[PDB]
Ligand binder design. Structure first.
Ligand SMILES: NC(=O)c1cccnc1
Ligand SMILES: NC(=O)c1cccnc1
Ligand SMILES: NC(=O)c1cccnc1
Ligand SMILES: NC(=O)c1cccnc1
Ligand SMILES: [Zn+2]
Ligand SMILES: [Zn+2]
Ligand SMILES: [Zn+2]
Ligand SMILES: [Zn+2]
Lengths: 190, 190, 189, 190
């Protein structure tokens, strides 16, 4: 069956050394795996959803503005996809199976039309990749669970700034959400 | 109390003579009232949400594609706001209290972040304007009702192709949704 | 594949002569068709969801309280299913494919777990029956549309007190929601 | 200023020594604080929502069935509120400001009418209590955040079976959700 891979916030501001809200080394370490798994999913016929923070510096009505420094600002290089994943987007961004969705909350579902697009395509399984494991990925996974999706987490293609938080989230995915943990070849991990 | 005015699909494709899905004369007849009530709402400090159909011609996954001819296509003049309402947007579009939201369903809430933006601002009352009364306006109103908003309908600033459908919708707003019917001066109608 | 039939508000208070918010004769006229189509859907292996108004008197926080007289009050006979449809529920209510869901808004989806139950079963098509065509049925249909369900409307198994409103709703289902209008044999009209 | 206290899954099966899915001693340890803070909120005129797991044996369509042993089964003692909280419910459950809501997912919002009831009362702040901090409480908190509620967490009135998961969740509430941590007297903890 055809699935959907969700690419969560893997942008310059979350990954690069000078990124405004960078997760640093652990985020950079998944660059090869996240691009590889995305290409693999696309090649086999899956839908690809880039779900990307789209913030505005002067937005005092957003509770998040008080919690983190400005990041992924609309019209800035901070929103550019990091590494070879960006090259994949140059090659296939205009394809009918590839989507770019701006989001304001951590979850890829919140205030977006992600659920609608998935339901149009009768997709029952989402495959999650990106950063941070315990924030945008976690919120997306919980929303996916409540919306009745089967969930796959690409373990080597998610990362957090805190190793303990990364480990909590992975445990939560498997034990509470019943997610399948998979590698960069989309093979289950035992 | 600060309210929000929702401006629904009042574009060239729904209003102009040559509009791809035009409501024709009844839609054109509300041009003065819809621009007047929007400027009045903006001047008093209300939030203004332009919630506009954003369709793609090649979208075989959208059930609406089979129901209506192509309308409000991306990058076309069909998506331009009709009359003085368009002029108002050119003057005040970049103001912090004015919003543009692309939508794919009839309802202004479906797959958008309208509810999120309204709740950020603690808005309890929505004021509905636009076309068509029995489709995009009706769906928006029903969603607003289920989301617990108080509803105001600007009767002289909503219109449909079918008079019987326009009349059904107005009756539904008042008797089933408990909406207040108001004029272009935002005064209740008796 | 396996579809779900939604049975909307077909209770004493909406149908019977003495019903608190009765649609009267037009609602009573669909009794045979609504019971027949529900029994048919169940025989075909479909899921059946009874989605029924569950109101409380003196619920001042509900906006509907000011719009309609008290109806379908919790613990009252007004919530009893009307006619042979009630007999069907007595017979098959304990079956794993048959559900009873209390609702407070007109739409069967609003504040309920209907969508969750349907998605658990990977249901892609809902079949709508009940009353009123232009209120609870219409709201349920619109929610179903926005939630990406294919929709079937059993034309002889929906009713309103207002003929013009019933007609509007049927047109809206077909032309705006892209719903299939079907008969009591579940054949397209 | 009228708030709503949410009492999440504080029942025999999650708390009692012989509970089917018991969090054990840490859950038992909060019994005094959770009952005290609930009685306080009620005295202050707040709404009280008991949001309680309602599961069925042989519910093969529920993904949770494969993740945890049977717990909080409808019609069983497992669903009984633990400690003085249960006594409070006997005393005041029939009050108009006190609600009992059955739920099937971890989040108190998922498939329930919680949001609807809160919006009816124009509640803007939810106060969270119960178990487990990193499951039902966490999911409820994340849903509350996405739905635009201000969040208070009663720190001494939430618990998990795993202390490290409790710590993660508390950090997540404060740093990611912008929640206020409060004590059993509803005073902010600094
Ligand atoms: N990508 C993320 O997890 C994230 C973290 C903090 C703020 N916004 C997004
Ligand atoms: N604006 C509308 O009511 C409408 C009608 C048909 C299709 N899309 C939008
Ligand atoms: N069943 C209905 O359509 C209905 C109408 C009015 C109030 N409640 C329910
Ligand atoms: N109360 C909870 O956190 C919980 C944990 C596991 C299953 N169901 C509920
Ligand atoms: Zn962000
Ligand atoms: Zn359209
Ligand atoms: Zn009702
Ligand atoms: Zn449970």
């Amino acid at each position: 069956m055809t699935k959907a891979l969700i690419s969560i916030d893997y942008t310059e501001d979350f990954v690069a050394d000078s990124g405004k809200l960078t997760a640093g080394a652990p985020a950079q370490a998944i660059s090869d795996a996240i691009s590889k798994v995305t290409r693999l999913a696309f090649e086999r016929g899956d839908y690809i959803f880039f779900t990307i923070d789209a913030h505005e510096e002067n937005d005092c009505f957003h509770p998040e503005s008080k919690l983190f420094p400005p990041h992924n600002l609309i019209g800035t290089s901070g929103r550019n996809l990091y590494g070879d994943l960006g090259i994949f987007y140059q090659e296939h961004g205009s394809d009918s199976r590839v989507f770019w969705m701006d989001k304001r909350h951590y979850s890829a579902f919140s205030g977006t039309d992600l659920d609608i697009r998935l339901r149009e395509r009768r997709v029952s399984t989402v495959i999650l990749t990106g950063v941070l494991t315990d924030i945008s990925v976690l919120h997306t996974a919980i929303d996916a669970y409540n919306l009745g999706y089967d969930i796959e987490i690409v373990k080597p293609a998610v990362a957090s700034i805190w190793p303990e938080n990364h480990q909590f989230a992975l445990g939560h995915f498997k034990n509470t959400l019943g997610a399948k943990l998979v590698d960069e070849n989309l093979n289950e991990l035992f």
